[PDB]
Amino acid sequence: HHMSAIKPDMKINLRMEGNVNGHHFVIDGDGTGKPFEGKQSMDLEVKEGGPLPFAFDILTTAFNRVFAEYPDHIQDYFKQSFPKGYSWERSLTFEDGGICIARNDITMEGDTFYNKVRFHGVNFPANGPVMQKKTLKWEPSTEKMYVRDGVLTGDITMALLLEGNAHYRCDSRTTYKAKEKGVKLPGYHLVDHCIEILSHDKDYNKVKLYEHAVAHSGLPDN
Amino acid sequence: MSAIKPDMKINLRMEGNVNGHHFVIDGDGTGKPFEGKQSMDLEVKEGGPLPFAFDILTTAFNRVFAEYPDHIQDYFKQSFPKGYSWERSLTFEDGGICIARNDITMEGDTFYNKVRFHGVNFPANGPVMQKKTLKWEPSTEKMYVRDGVLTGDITMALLLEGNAHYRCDSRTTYKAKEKGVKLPGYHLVDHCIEILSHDKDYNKVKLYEHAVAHSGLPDN
Amino acid sequence: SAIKPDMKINLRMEGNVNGHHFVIDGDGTGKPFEGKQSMDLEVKEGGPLPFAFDILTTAFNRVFAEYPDHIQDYFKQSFPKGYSWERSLTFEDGGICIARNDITMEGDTFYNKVRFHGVNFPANGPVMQKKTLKWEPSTEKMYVRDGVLTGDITMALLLEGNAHYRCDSRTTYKAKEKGVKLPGYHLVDHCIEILSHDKDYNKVKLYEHAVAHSGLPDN
Amino acid sequence: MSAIKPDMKINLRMEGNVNGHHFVIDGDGTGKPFEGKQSMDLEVKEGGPLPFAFDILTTAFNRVFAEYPDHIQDYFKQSFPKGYSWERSLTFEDGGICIARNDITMEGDTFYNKVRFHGVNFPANGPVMQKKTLKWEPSTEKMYVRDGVLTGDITMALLLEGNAHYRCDSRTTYKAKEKGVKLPGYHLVDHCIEILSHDKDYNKVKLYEHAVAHSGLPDN
Ligand SMILES: O=S([O-])[O-]
Ligand SMILES: O=S([O-])[O-]
Numbered sequence: 001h002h003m004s005a006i007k008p009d010m011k012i013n014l015r016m017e018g019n020v021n022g023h024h025f026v027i028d029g030d031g032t033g034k035p036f037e038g039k040q041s042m043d044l045e046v047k048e049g050g051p052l053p054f055a056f057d058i059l060t061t062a063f064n065r066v067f068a069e070y071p072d073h074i075q076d077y078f079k080q081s082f083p084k085g086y087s088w089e090r091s092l093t094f095e096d097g098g099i100c101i102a103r104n105d106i107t108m109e110g111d112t113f114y115n116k117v118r119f120h121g122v123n124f125p126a127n128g129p130v131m132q133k134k135t136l137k138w139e140p141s142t143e144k145m146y147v148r149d150g151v152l153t154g155d156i157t158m159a160l161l162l163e164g165n166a167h168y169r170c171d172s173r174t175t176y177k178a179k180e181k182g183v184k185l186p187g188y189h190l191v192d193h194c195i196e197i198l199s200h201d202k203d204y205n206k207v208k209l210y211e212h213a214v215a216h217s218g219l220p221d222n
Numbered sequence: 223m224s225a226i227k228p229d230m231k232i233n234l235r236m237e238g239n240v241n242g243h244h245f246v247i248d249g250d251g252t253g254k255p256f257e258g259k260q261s262m263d264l265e266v267k268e269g270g271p272l273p274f275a276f277d278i279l280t281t282a283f284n285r286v287f288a289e290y291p292d293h294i295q296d297y298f299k300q301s302f303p304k305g306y307s308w309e310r311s312l313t314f315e316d317g318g319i320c321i322a323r324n325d326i327t328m329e330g331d332t333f334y335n336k337v338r339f340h341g342v343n344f345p346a347n348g349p350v351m352q353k354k355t356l357k358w359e360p361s362t363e364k365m366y367v368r369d370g371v372l373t374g375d376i377t378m379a380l381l382l383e384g385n386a387h388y389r390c391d392s393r394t395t396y397k398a399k400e401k402g403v404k405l406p407g408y409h410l411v412d413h414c415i416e417i418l419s420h421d422k423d424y425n426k427v428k429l430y431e432h433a434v435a436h437s438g439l440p441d442n
Numbered sequence: 443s444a445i446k447p448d449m450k451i452n453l454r455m456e457g458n459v460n461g462h463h464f465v466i467d468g469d470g471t472g473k474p475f476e477g478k479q480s481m482d483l484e485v486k487e488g489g490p491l492p493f494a495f496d497i498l499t500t501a502f503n504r505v506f507a508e509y510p511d512h513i514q515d516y517f518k519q520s521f522p523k524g525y526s527w528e529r530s531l532t533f534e535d536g537g538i539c540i541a542r543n544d545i546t547m548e549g550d551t552f553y554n555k556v557r558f559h560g561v562n563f564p565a566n567g568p569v570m571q572k573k574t575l576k577w578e579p580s581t582e583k584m585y586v587r588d589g590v591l592t593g594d595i596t597m598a599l600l601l602e603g604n605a606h607y608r609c610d611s612r613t614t615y616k617a618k619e620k621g622v623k624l625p626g627y628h629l630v631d632h633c634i635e636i637l638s639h640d641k642d643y644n645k646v647k648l649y650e651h652a653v654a655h656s657g658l659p660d661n
Numbered sequence: 662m663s664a665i666k667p668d669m670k671i672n673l674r675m676e677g678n679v680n681g682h683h684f685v686i687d688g689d690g691t692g693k694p695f696e697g698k699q700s701m702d703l704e705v706k707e708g709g710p711l712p713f714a715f716d717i718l719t720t721a722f723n724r725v726f727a728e729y730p731d732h733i734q735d736y737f738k739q740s741f742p743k744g745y746s747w748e749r750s751l752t753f754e755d756g757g758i759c760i761a762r763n764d765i766t767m768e769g770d771t772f773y774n775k776v777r778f779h780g781v782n783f784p785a786n787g788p789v790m791q792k793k794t795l796k797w798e799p800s801t802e803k804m805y806v807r808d809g810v811l812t813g814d815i816t817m818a819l820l821l822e823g824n825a826h827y828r829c830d831s832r833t834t835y836k837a838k839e840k841g842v843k844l845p846g847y848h849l850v851d852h853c854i855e856i857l858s859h860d861k862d863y864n865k866v867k868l869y870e871h872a873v874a875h876s877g878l879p880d881n
């Protein structure tokens with residue numbers, strides 16, 4: 001409908017501030033990605049509150065659905081929200097009562113996406129896998145995208161693999177809102193995700209993160 | 223070892239109660255277990271016409287009908303000849319809650335399904351009692367082990383009139399009849415279910431499902 | 443008028459938890475206006491039960507609640523014709539139960555047709571391992587939703603080792619007769635107790651006390 | 662001698678963000694810890710007029726203000742002079758979700774409250790963004806120990822215009838600052854909370870709460 005100004009190779013700048021279980025932190029991010037291939041990588045550095053007393057994994061989905069491969073037949077709300085950009089709000093509900101909220105305001109200047117991220121988490125039990133740092137990774141997921149109360153909404157059944165091979169369940173709901181008027185809303189669709197910490201130092205003060213995401217219509221034609 | 227044929231017949235009897243309304247539904251169909259495809263003709267034998275949306279029942283009418291790749295353990299085909307059973311909760315966003323069970327056995331080239339379905343707390347003016355549902359959207363079941371039992375969780379959504387959606391969370395626990403059947407690792411199962419045809423009051427329904435198991439990105 | 447100060451209670455429950463079928467008969471007595479009732483239960487089929495008896499006990503009638511004059515008593519007003527209820531029980535470890543009761547009256551006896559189904563209880567959870575001790579006293583929040591009287595409760599089972607096991611209850615209550623006036627928002631305090639039982643819980647004596655009120659500061 | 666005096670003052674500063682809207686609210690109040698009664702005058706310092714229902718904030722503006730009987734351990738009065746902190750989640754039935762924190766300290770006759778409040782996913786057409794709330798109904802908080810921490814769960818409801826209700830589930834975790842403060846057994850805390858008065862835009866609000874601990878039936 002208009003030129004997004006999104007290049008096949010983009011830079012990513014990010015600042016997160018937040019508080020989990022009373023512990024304040026600031027984390028900076030610098031990365032690169034390929035929006036049309038749905039792939040991105042980022043180097044993160046804890047600037048305040050290091051070392052973190054909680055599992056770094058709970059934060060990683062808060063570190064942009066622009067980085068998702070959208071096929072021609074599915075409306076791409078995220079790429080169409082640029083150059084102006086968009087924002088999202090998210091709740092994360094963990095099976096043991098831990099609850100997080102998160103926000104990201106996403107803008108673009110030239111070849112770089114800028115991200116102002118906030119993350120707040122409460123009610124994580126002392127001996128749960130989050131405060132005990134017993135998480136290994138997020139398992140691959142599928143986000144369900146649909147218009148709810150006039151707003152594009154993504155719901156996800158997520159699972160963290162734990163040490164000892166158990167899983168730890170988290171339900172995610174994200175609301176996505178374009179900054180500019182006139183962005184077409186998509187029909188129901190699915191977005192496959194996989195996210196991975198490629199490397200980190202001992203205290204997770206420095207972390208290299210990667211995501212791959214692909215939009216599709218599900219069976220039978222996916 | 224499983225004795226599962228490339229073409230199988232399916233016999234089904236469901237009895238249940240939703241909102242205090244009792245019903246009995248018989249099913250006769252055929253499927254291709256290794257293609258993850260199946261079809262069934264359903265007939266309401268008691269309780270017709272149903273005062274609620276037929277769609278709430280349809281996932282209760284067998285993960286044997288899922289295409290499993292070699293690298294993922296197929297718990298369901300490995301549960302035969304002896305068979306398996308499942309229990310399910312369906313939690314809808316307006317407080318409607320269903321439970322369902324199915325005991326699955328096999329005799330020759332026919333699967334037998336003893337199905338029970340109970341639903342409570344559906345609001346009088348919600349999309350279920352008002353029959354405003356159109357279809358289940360395609361879904362992806364998350365398969366994992368919890369307390370020694372294979373468990374599938376799904377973020378499901380019913381398409382409604384006007385292209386609204388009505389959310390339902392599914393949890394299924396699957397248990398082989400035979401002791402010591404090997405549990406699979408974490409995996410995904412893509413699903414799509416469709417009422418191909420029905421009469422006006424949904425006393426007669428033709429149902430279809432396609433399901434494929436996979437490892438998610440980046441492999442799938 | 444229809445309901446007497448001393449009433450008798452007849453009950454038949456049929457159900458299935460974890461794939462295990464059972465039938466339980468009940469005979470008891472209660473004082474509706476005092477909100478008190480007692481019942482002797484007997485497992486007729488499926489004994490000994492392989493799960494915690496405690497999960498069943500709220501399924502074994504809000505007629506047995508003391509309602510003050512300033513709150514509409516939907517339940518006593520539903521007789522002689524009677525009423526029905528549907529319930530979901532959502533336990534914190536994924537166990538989910540649904541239950542129904544059709545309540546009728548003839549003479550001085552209430553009759554209860556009860557159904558109870560439970561799924562997805564973990565093998566090593568407190569229910570399948572029978573590690574529950576009692577329900578803690580609760581308060582049911584009563585309100586109207588989509589024309590129907592609804593009760594929500596944050597409940598808790600005390601377990602061996604003194605931990606608690608959380609359950610959320612939603613009940614929908616429906617009078618048989620049309621035109622029964624719905625109450626305003628109110629609270630109902632409950633306490634439920636197994637007074638006695640044999641080793642396998644094939645025979646159980648159950649007791650409940652319930653009192654309706656307006657909450658602080660008027661309670 | 663006692664850290665808790667019959668008549669105490671309350672100073673409070675809340676900062677927060679609901680649906681992207683930043684705000685700062687100051688409070689000055691007085692209360693009677695032993696009678697479980699308190700009142701506070703609140704003033705929106707930044708972000709007025711608030712675009713959301715003020716009612717969602719009100720339980721975030723101290724369980725020291727609760728009448729505890731002799732037979733129930735009073736964790737909150739035992740937490741002073743050093744103080745305590747709480748974290749809370751508020752889960753509304755339409756997907757709006759809030760988290761809040763309060764760090765409570767004491768100097769002389771005054772409690773000091775550092776409060777943070779964050780809310781997301783409230784729909785534009787819902788009662789919160791539409792400002793259609795009237796009051797919280799009277800509630801009963803269920804207090805119990807989980808993983809060594811005092812925890813309170815509440816089935817809450819806002820009364821709406823037209824006399825419908827809007828449900829919210831609250832979980833609070835309470836933690837004394839000092840080591841070795843004895844945890845109480847299971848108990849109930851009754852609450853009622855009321856906006857006594859406000860100006861048109863809720864830039865100025867006078868708030869009141871009454872709370873009483875008890876053991877439930879038959880004890881109460
Ligand atoms: O991002 S994927 O490689 O987990
Ligand atoms: O079974 S699918 O085509 O909905």
Ligand SMILES: O=S([O-])[O-]
Nearest residue numbers: 633634635650651
């Ligand atoms: O019924 S009360 O005594 O638990």
Ligand SMILES: O=S([O-])[O-]
Nearest residue numbers: 853854855870871
């Ligand atoms: O404190 S009460 O009056 O809502």
